[PDB]
């Protein structure tokens, strides 16, 4: 009864949309799996090779639907964490630009995302439709 992606907040929505992208079969993977750290400030790449890219795509789609158009730099800032710089104090280090750029380009290629006249990219009509359907299915499957 009038459900959006703002009725599953943080974990079940991601576990639902990543699984949906897995079942969809469309890969959109540029080959970065098992080769990249997902940021310059980490120590090791994600544990499971199958799933991290799809979860990245799920996160960026959900973020760009919950808020307005946002850019590769904004996603890099959001996904960049701290870094053990040695014996120096920890520091915020931005993520790998290429991975976020390629995830957004993959979303554009699928067509769920369009550009904005001011800069950045916003979720498309079909993208928002798919995300709302995913939310409704998540509510109807696991409360």
């Amino acid at each position: 009864p009038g459900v959006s992606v703002r009725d599953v907040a943080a974990q079940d929505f991601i576990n639902a949309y990543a699984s949906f992208l897995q079942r969809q079969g469309k890969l959109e993977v540029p080959g970065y799996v098992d080769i990249v750290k997902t940021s310059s400030g980490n120590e090791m790449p994600p544990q499971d090779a199958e799933g991290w890219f799809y979860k990245r795509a799920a996160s960026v789609a959900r973020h760009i639907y919950m808020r307005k158009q946002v850019g590769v730099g904004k996603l890099n800032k959001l996904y960049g964490g701290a870094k053990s710089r040695g014996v120096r104090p920890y520091k915020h280090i931005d993520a790998s630009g290429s991975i976020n750029r390629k995830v957004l380009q993959a979303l554009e290629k699928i067509g769920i995302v369009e550009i904005s006249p001011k800069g950045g990219r916003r979720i498309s009509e079909n993208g928002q439709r798919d995300l709302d359907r995913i939310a409704a299915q998540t509510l109807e499957e696991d409360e």
Binding site: R6, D7, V8, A9, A10, M66
Partner: protein, 137 residues
């Protein structure tokens, strides 16, 4: 009608209107504010007076300015004060009074904004009151 609430620096502005029992926090329902331990801290300004006790009021709040628990405190204060204002202006002054009594009998800075502000940090030492260390001898 409209109220605001703060704990340290986060301000939450809540609009309460005649609607159908819809209480939002940032677009998500009150079940998913997700501090994952203060999900009952946010429930408190509604569970206190009554189980639901309100299916005719709609509260939409938007919070920014502080941290996670600061914004939780800000929203739980703002929605309670919005409820107080709504009863003050429309429902009844008596009803406002008995719900203020319950709010003050469970007072958690729910109605009065906390005045604890970070004190300015002075030269010669990290922190406002702690000073650097000297051994000299």
């Amino acid at each position: 009608v409209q109220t605001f609430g703060k704990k340290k620096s986060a301000t939450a502005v809540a609009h309460v209107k005649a609607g159908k029992g819809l209480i939002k926090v940032n677009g998500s329902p009150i079940t998913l504010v997700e501090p994952e331990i203060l999900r009952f801290k946010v429930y408190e300004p509604l569970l206190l007076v009554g189980l639901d006790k309100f299916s005719n009021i709609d509260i939409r709040v938007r919070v920014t300015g502080g941290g996670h628990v600061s914004q939780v405190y800000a929203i739980r204060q703002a929605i309670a004060k919005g409820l107080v204002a709504y009863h003050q202006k429309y429902v009844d002054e008596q009803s406002k009074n008995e719900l203020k009594k319950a709010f003050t009998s469970y007072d958690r800075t729910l109605l009065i904004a906390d005045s604890r502000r970070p004190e300015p940090k002075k030269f010669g030492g990290k922190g406002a009151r702690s000073r650097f260390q000297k051994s000299y001898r």
